[PDB]
């Protein structure tokens, strides 16, 4: 079993965009910004516990940060991971 500390610090933020909203309306899916090293099992456990819902499956992908220039110097935003969490068609956060 995963300890509650890990579950408390694997979720970071809910992703907000047009694709995320469409997924919520049509596929009953929430899109989350999660820790870079969280696994699908950890994400599923954390969603089931901290939001008290039932999840079918988790899809994950790593988003690479963009190279940017801020007044003549080149930076790079950090990579982050996002999860597509499919709920069990009765929960509706």
Pattern 7-46, RNA, x by CB under 7 A: --------xxxxxx--x---x-x-x-------xxx-----
CA nearest to 32, candidates 16, 47, 46, 15: 15
Q: How far is the CB of 93 from RNA (least distance, A)?
A: 15
Calpha distance 73→30 (Å, rounded): 36
Q: How far is the CB of 12 from RNA (least distance, A)?
A: 14
CA atoms within 13 A on the CB side of 41: 3
Please name the residue that has the structure tokens 């110097």: 73
Residue 61 found at the interface with RNA (CB under 7 A): yes
Residue pair 15/33 in contact (Cβ under 8 Å)? The answer is: yes
Residue 64 found at the interface with RNA (CB under 7 A): yes
Q: What are the residues binding RNA (CB under 7 A)?
A: 15-20, 23, 27, 29, 31, 39-41, 57, 59-64, 66-70, 81-82, 84, 86
């Amino acid at each position: 079993m995963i300890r509650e500390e890990r579950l408390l610090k694997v979720l970071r933020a809910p992703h907000v965009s047009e694709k995320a909203s469409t997924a919520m309306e049509k596929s009953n899916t929430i899109v989350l910004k999660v820790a870079k090293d969280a696994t699908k099992a950890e994400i599923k456990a954390a969603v089931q516990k901290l939001f008290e819902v039932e999840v079918e499956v988790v899809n994950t992908l790593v988003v690479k940060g963009k190279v940017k220039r801020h007044g003549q110097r080149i930076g790079r935003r950090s990579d982050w991971k996002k999860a597509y969490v499919t709920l069990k068609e009765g929960q509706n956060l």
